[PDB]
């Protein structure tokens, strides 16, 4: 680690020679890396909210008319035993008696009970709904296994379009970080025409030319990722302050999950490696034009 | 031992800069090759180090032939030639002290003997007070001087010259020529290529002249 | 226009000097213009998607019994001339609302009053509309069921403000991103040469003359920058136009995705080429200020 | 007339290039200024075009004062000086044909005059063969020849020669000197600067020798 001292030494004064351009080329590239972090913040907080808050795929299932006053407990006990629906909300015949009198007064008697069916997210497909309709109907004492759909048809269709457009935006941003690193590094290299010629005409090794440009690209990507993380964290705090007054009408305390430590290391290492390969592609495709 | 036979050069436009030249070159002996303005002397002068391929023919260097070889072999043997140029290929961003320290850090010397080697390679040129500064405020009379100061580093086996004394006085030409003359005490060749006729008339060495890239004037 | 032909010739010679480098510069400046366009059509289609939505702002306009239908037409003219944003529908309580009485006579089992729904436009909304409407409401007889619904009304006011702040923040960071990326591209494009600025002034010239093929080069880079985005955004639109079909039929209607009309395309080209008129102008004079004696 | 007051110049590095230079530079005749390597024989020519400011005194040109020009007229007055360089500066990645036609564009040339002006300029140096190529494939002698060729155009009122024939042989040295020497029948002042004496000793014009910025000898 003694011959690599000079390669790390030269890039520091190379960047510090013109400080405003060095600041500008990191400020332009952190705000290009702000948006994958912002989209990742937007993605991962609505996903944990999607576990409990909005989706509740209940299917209104009616029991037999006057089979028994406590026949729903047997349905709960038998539906606990199979896959798919595990937890069943206990709604007996006396539950429907107390649950249907208020609706009549709000709008203006056998009364079979209404069961609660939750297929979670592994059997939420409409093609997989009919598989769950087979086991409920084949159990005796159940008359109406009536569909609801409507809102559930919209819930099972718009999520595909939102996932597809988010995947398209994510692919376009991973192409953007794949390309703006290479653009910035290759303009930094093509700003220097004399140096490669001087260290190549003088007897050397190709790795000696390769090392300082590669280290400069690596530290440029490192600085861009660090400034991107610092600029994203204050926006996460600003949005936490923006959602603090919105979450108090939802009835529960809500907070935004920030940039975790296990992914920031991955972001820094992929920015270092993309600076590595950007400087490799910028320098190898530049010193092949100096060998006649 | 540098051996020549019929070698030519036609880069892109078919301009026959060279067509063939044949001379042996003993180790330690000096030379003063020259020509006219359009004469192909600098291309021949670069064929020894061989940063371009010599097209037809082949060039023998020491005990090897380097005609069309790989890029993992040519810059290893490029460290033994004293590359100076007419145009000033110098690092404009970096200062003078590490312009001449490039062969030192390629050779991988320790950091303590860099300073005495550079000062030993600059006191005979005569530039220590005008060191540790940038070449953009150095005029050509010392820019050409610090250009050749990296050629005298680490005692190359063969030393090359691409028109020195272009921006120097005749007294400084004589001083820099006596700087070049003391290298002939050891086994390194001198390959001066100057247009000056009174400087080479004051001494007798191996004088050859190429006339428009063919044969020997 | 005889003196400006050398500027166009030098600009096209610079662009044709390194076709791969200039193509990569056009690609990096064009991939930045994709997201203002994408966010603009996303913000645009939700405006016509705000014509219909599931949480409709229902107003409890439950009037009296039997004789309320005769007085319903008398009172609808006074309230519509009060604020001007008032849409009231009326149905027959005895005949047309018998299905609403039969709603309780279903599998999920004339005392109920008449049902009327008032949905105003989004231009006249907020607490001020409620303050100007509840002062004269229930002005006839006694009116049962005065209990409004405002749980969805409060949340839609909160949710649209949040995504409005998010969209405003996204838009200002996009204009910052495009401004800095054209500044970075043009600045490194002119910093890639050093002698071409020096030699033009060491030989006596005009200060405006050296500005011509750099301002025109930046303007042509900005003008060619937006066109590649305007032949790439609609490609992604038609790639994502297939998924609109199966989610439109579940809405009970047919919805068409809007595109980039020619009124805003010229605006986007003008704002993307005008920043080449500024970035080159500042960067060249910053570069030549460092070479003046 | 071109007049000098008691002027000098140093830099930020502490090197005093000039320590007092005064001469009356008459219109029409030649000059053969020379000195040692550390002398200010090039920075004297750099002050004529006004691309550096003198540290001391005041500087005069033609019939006007070229001191304190706020970057709006020293673009204008520099155009009549074909100030040659020591090391060659050419517009790289640009052909020779419009490289010497650079000062004609600013001056307002027509379409027809550019061709014959470039042709007549390159006749005097004799390079109507490497005319449409780039200066990458030009060797150093013709690089110096096209560098000195672009000073010839626009017919400048004052000509400066900051070391020509440094990359030329003795046969073409007399020709490139006589290209300057034919300018005596027109009203142009030529400042030739060189190191060697052999072609200077074959002629007889004004000697302006300097030692560390002091002329002493040479009126
Ligand atoms: N890369 C090149 N491509 C084409 N022609 C070239 C190239 N390099 C040199 N030449 C030609 O080589 C000829 C002269 O070669 P040189 O030996 O360089 O001449 P010279 O006498 O050395 O001039 P200088 O100033 O001393 S380099 C000229 O006709 C040039 O056009
Ligand atoms: N821009 C500058 N900044 C600082 N010092 C300078 C500058 N230009 C020249 N010098 C110094 O001034 C002295 C000679 O100046 P110059 O006139 O440029 O040299 P010269 O006339 O070119 O002599 P040459 O190169 O042998 S023809 C040297 O000590 C230089 O280091």
Curated annotation (Swiss-Prot), chain C:
Keyword set, alphabetical order: Cell cycle, Cell division, Cell inner membrane, Cell membrane, Membrane, Transmembrane, Transmembrane helix
GO cellular component term, pick one: Gram-negative-bacterium-type cell wall
Stretches of the chain found on the membrane's Periplasmic side: 44-165, 239-264
Compartment(s) where it occurs, according to its Swiss-Prot or TrEMBL record: Cell inner membrane
Family, similarity comment: Belongs to the ABC-4 integral membrane protein family. FtsX subfamily.
Summary of subunit composition and partner proteins: Forms a membrane-associated complex with FtsE.
Function recorded in the entry: Part of the ABC transporter FtsEX involved in cellular division. Important for assembly or stability of the septal ring. Encoded in an operon consisting of genes ftsY, ftsE and ftsX.
Further facts: Overexpression leads to strong inhibition of growth, cell filamentation and eventually cell death.
Protein name, as recorded: Cell division protein FtsX
Species name: Escherichia coli (strain K12)
Parent sequence residues shown: 53 to 351 of 352
UniProtKB/Swiss-Prot annotation, chain D:
Swiss-Prot/TrEMBL keywords: ATP-binding, Cell cycle, Cell division, Cell inner membrane, Cell membrane, Membrane, Nucleotide-binding
Cell compartments where the protein resides: Cell inner membrane
Traits of the deletion mutant: Inactivation results in a filamented cellular morphology, but not in a temperature-sensitive phenotype.
Gene3D superfamilies assigned: P-loop containing nucleotide triphosphate hydrolases (3.40.50.300)
Signal peptide annotation: none
SUPFAM superfamilies recorded: P-loop containing nucleoside triphosphate hydrolases (SSF52540)
PROSITE patterns in the cross-refs: ABC_TRANSPORTER_1 (PS00211), ABC_TRANSPORTER_2 (PS50893)
Main location: membrane
Alphabetized InterPro entries for the sequence: AAA+_ATPase (IPR003593), ABC_transporter-like_ATP-bd (IPR003439), ABC_transporter-like_CS (IPR017871), ABC_transpr_LolD-like (IPR015854), Cell_div_FtsE (IPR005286), P-loop_NTPase (IPR027417)
Occurrences of domain ABC transporter (ranges): 2-219
BP-aspect Gene Ontology terms: cell division; division septum assembly; FtsZ-dependent cytokinesis; peptidoglycan turnover; positive regulation of cell division; response to antibiotic; transmembrane transport
Single annotated GO MF: transmembrane transporter activity
Keyword Cell division listed: yes
Membrane-topology descriptor: Peripheral membrane protein
SMART domains from the UniProt entry: AAA
Binding locations of ATP: 35-42
GO cellular component, one term: division septum
Assembly, per entry: Homodimer. Forms a membrane-associated complex with FtsX. Interacts with FtsZ, independently of FtsX, FtsA or ZipA.
Record-stated family: Belongs to the ABC transporter superfamily.
Biological function: Part of the ABC transporter FtsEX involved in cellular division. Important for assembly or stability of the septal ring.
PANTHER family xrefs: CELL DIVISION ATP-BINDING PROTEIN FTSE (PTHR24220:SF470), IMPORT ATP-BINDING PROTEIN (PTHR24220)
Protein name as it appears in the record: Cell division ATP-binding protein FtsE
